[PDB]
Amino acid sequence: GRPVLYQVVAQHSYSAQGPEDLGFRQGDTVDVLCEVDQAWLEGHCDGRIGIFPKCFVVPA
């Protein structure tokens, strides 16, 4: 299992283009699973797991 580092809140919406992407709505809570890169995070939301830009979320 992937432990949840912390939760973040989406400040901007984001639509997933492929299966590696995590999409979400503005206001969704996201469970961060990996601090991938300077600009990318891996997380879970609504059963889905994927990566997304760090600049779309703020700490929960």
Curated annotation (Swiss-Prot):
All copies of domain SH3, residue ranges: 3-60
Tissue expression from the record: Widely expressed. Detected in pancreas, liver, kidney, spleen, prostate, small intestine and colon.
Domain of life per record: Eukaryota
Post-translational modification: Interaction with YWHAZ depends on phosphorylation by PKA.
Compartments where found: Cytoplasm; Cell membrane
Signal peptide (residue range): none
Family listed: Belongs to the NCF2/NOXA1 family.
Summary of subunit composition and partner proteins: NOX1, NOXA1, NOXO1, RAC1 and CYBA forms a functional multimeric complex supporting ROS production. Interaction with YWHAZ prevents the interaction of NOXA1 with NOXO1 and RAC1 and its targeting to membranes, hence reducing its ability to activate NOX1. Interacts (via N-terminus) with SH3PXD2A and SH3PXD2B; the interaction is direct. Interacts with NCF1. Interacts with RAC1. Interacts with NOXO1. Interacts with NOX1.
Function per UniProt: Functions as an activator of NOX1, a superoxide-producing NADPH oxidase. Functions in the production of reactive oxygen species (ROS) which participate in a variety of biological processes including host defense, hormone biosynthesis, oxygen sensing and signal transduction. May also activate CYBB/gp91phox and NOX3.
Domain remarks: The SH3 domain mediates interaction with NOXO1 and NCF1 and has autoregulatory function. The TPR repeats mediate interaction with RAC1.
Protein name per Swiss-Prot or TrEMBL: NADPH oxidase activator 1
Species assigned in the record: Homo sapiens (Human)
Taxonomic lineage of the native organism: Eukaryota, Metazoa, Chordata, Craniata, Vertebrata
Gene: NOXA1
Shown residues within the full chain: 397 to 456 of 476
